[PDB]
From a paper:
SETD3 functions as an actin-specific histidine N-methyltransferase, and comprises an N-terminal SET domain and a C-terminal Rubisco large subunit methyltransferase (LSMT) like domain.
Whereas most diffracted X-rays to more than 6 Å, the best crystal diffracted to 3.5 Å resolution. It belonged to the P21 space group, and the structure was solved by molecular replacement using PDB 3W95and 6MBKas templates. However, only chains B and F in one copy had relatively clear electron density, hence they were used for structural analyses (left). We clearly identified electron density for the zinc chelated by the zinc finger of 2A even though zinc ions were not supplemented during purification. We validated the presence of zinc in the structure by calculating polder maps at the 2A zinc finger, which revealed positive difference densities for zinc ion. Comparing the two independently determined SETD3-2A complex structures showed that while the conformation of each component was highly similar (RMSD between the crystal and EM structures of EV71 2A was 0.49 Å, and that between SETD3 structures was 0.64 Å), their relative positions were slightly shifted, which contributes to the increased overall RMSD to 1.20 Å. We then aligned the crystal and EM structures with respect to SETD3, and identified a rotation between SETD3 and 2A.
Numbering used by the authors:
A (entry chain F): 6 to 146
B (entry chain B): 21 to 498
The structure:
Amino acid sequence: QSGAIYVGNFRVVNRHLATHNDWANLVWEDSSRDLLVSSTTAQGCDTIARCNCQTGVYYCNSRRKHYPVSFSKPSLIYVEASEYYPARYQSHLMLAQGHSEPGDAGGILRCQHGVVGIVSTGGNGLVGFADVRDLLWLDEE
Amino acid sequence: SPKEILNLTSELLQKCSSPAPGPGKEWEEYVQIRTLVEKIRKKQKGLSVTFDGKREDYFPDLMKWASENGASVEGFEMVNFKEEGFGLRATRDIKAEELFLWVPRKLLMTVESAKNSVLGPLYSQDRILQAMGNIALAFHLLCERASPNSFWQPYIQTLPSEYDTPLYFEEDEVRYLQSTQAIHDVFSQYKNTARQYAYFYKVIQTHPHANKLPLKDSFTYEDYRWAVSSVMTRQNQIPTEDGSRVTLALIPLWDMCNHTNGLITTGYNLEDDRCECVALQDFRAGEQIYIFYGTRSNAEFVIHSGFFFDNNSHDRVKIKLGVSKSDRLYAMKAEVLARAGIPTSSVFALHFTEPPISAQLLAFLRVFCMTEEELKEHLLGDSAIDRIFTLGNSEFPVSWDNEVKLWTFLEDRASLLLKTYKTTIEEDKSVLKNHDLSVRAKMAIKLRLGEKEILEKAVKSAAVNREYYRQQMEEKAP
Ligand SMILES: Nc1ncnc2c1ncn2[C@@H]1O[C@H](CSCC[C@H](N)C(=O)O)[C@@H](O)[C@H]1O
C-alpha cells in the first residue's frame, strides 16, 4: 500500500499530499478532482479498471485494513472545507459509508477488473473516492 | 447424456437472449421462461450431489478443518435462529470493536482459487467465466461440491440446500410483486440466471477442457440455481494475493452471521493475509452475533440476499426522471449536465430516512423548473463557480419559487406512482397481520408495502416542504 496508483510510466496520487518531486515531474493536475499524476521511470504493476463497478474494497489507513464499500457514481459533490482544501466544486467523487479519517487519504479502491479510485475526502461517516477510470490516457504507451 | 436437456436448454438461451417484450408484457415472458425451466427441472434429479445427513451435523467438522488452518472457533456457536435461520451465538461476552473472527485466505474460495483449480482450464477459454466472478465462483463451489477429496468440503457441507432468492419463488409468490419496481429486477435475475445455465450446460458438453470436470456427468438447474444463489447471498470482495485487484470470495464461518443495521465492520488484513471481523456492538453471552451486510435496498436484499430487513434505514426505490426533448430550454440545460455530472436521464432514488430526496436528485429536480434568467446565473459571474457547487445544498435554495414547483412535481409524480401499484398501503398492512403467507411470500409483499411506505414519507415531506416554501412569500425575506 503505497498510497498511489503506479501504472506504466505514471504515478497517480491525491493532489494535496503530493511531494514536490511530483510537481517536478508533473504530467497532469486538477484541483477539482484531488488528483495528481506524475511521471515515473519504473513500470508500475497496477492495472486501471475500465469497469463501472460500484462495489469495491478500499484500504483504511487508520484501521490498516481493506473494507468493501458500495459507492455512488462519479458525481460533483459538496465537500466542506478542511485543513487542505476550502469548500470548492469537487467532481468525480464516489461516496460510500465507511471509516475514513485524516491520513486515510490514499487508500486504493478497486473493482474486480482492477483499480477504481483513491480516497480523497472523508467525514460524517462517509468516505470519498476520486475516480480515475475515466482517464484512458492513463495506460501503457 | 441425455441431450433432451441440451435441446430444452438450446431454446432457453435463445428465448432468454431476447430483449425486453415491454412493460406489462414481461410477466408473459417470465412465465414463458419458467415453464421451460420447470420442464427441465422436473426432468432432472435435482441437486447432483446430496449430503447424507442434515445441515447442522456438519458444523463441528467445519470448526476442526478451520482450526487446523488457524480460524477463530471460540466465542460463538452454531444455533438455528427462528427469524434469521442458522447464525452465530456468543458463548461469552463480546465488547464493541472486539475482534472475534479471523480467517486465513487459504480457507476462502476465491476466483484466484478458481483459476488454479479444475475450472481453470475452462476459465482459460471461456470469456463469461473470465468476466463474471459471481458465476465463476459458483462453478468453483459446484466443482468442489462434487469432489469428495476437496479441502473445502467441510465448508460446502454446511451450506444450505435451498435459499429464499426469487429463483426459488413460485408463480403465486412472484404474483404478489406485480406493478412494482423490484419485479422488473426480479425478472432480470431469473432471465440472466436461466440464460447462463443454458450457455454453460452446452459448453461443458462441448468444451474439451471440461471433459475432466465432474459436472459433465450431472449439471442440473437446481445445481446452478443453488450455486449462484449461494454466491450472491454470502459473497464478500477481498483483494487477490498480489493485491493488484479485488476478487469475490466465500469467506467460511464469517458468512453464517446474520444481519442487523449498523456499519460495516468486516475487513481483510492483507499483511496477515486473513479476514477480520470486529464486533458491531456488545454481544452478551447467548446473544446472536450479527454483522452488517451493507447499505443495500430491500429490493437488493430480496433479490441478492434473500430476506426483508425490518427498520432498514437504507431502503430506497428507483425513480426514472429525464429532460424531455420537447423542452425549449434543452440547449441551455444541456450545458449543466456535463459540468454537473448529471446524465440526460437516469434512475434516481427516493430514500426512506430523512431527507427523502437526495442532494443529487435535488441537483436534477432544481434545474427541472428553472427559468431562463436563473440558467445564466450559474453560467456567467463571480458566483457561477460557487453556485453550481451549492446546487445540492438545501440551505442554499436556487430560487424560492422553484422550490414549490419541485415539490409540486413530486406531489404529482409520487401520487401517480401510488396509483400504479395494484394494491394500497392500507390493504398490505392487513395481509401480513391476518394471512398465513409463505416465508418467501412474506418477503415479497413486505417489499411491495415498503416501496409504497417509502413514497408515503416522500409525499408528506414534499407536502411539508411545499407548504413551507409557500409560507415564505409573505415575509419577503432576503
Ligand atoms: N435479517 C435476516 N432475516 C432473515 N434471514 C437473514 C437475515 N440476514 C441474513 N439472513 C440469512 O442469511 C443468509 C446468508 S448466510 C448467513 C448465515 C445463515 N444463518 C445461514 O444459515 O446460511 C441469507 O440468504 C438469509 O437466509
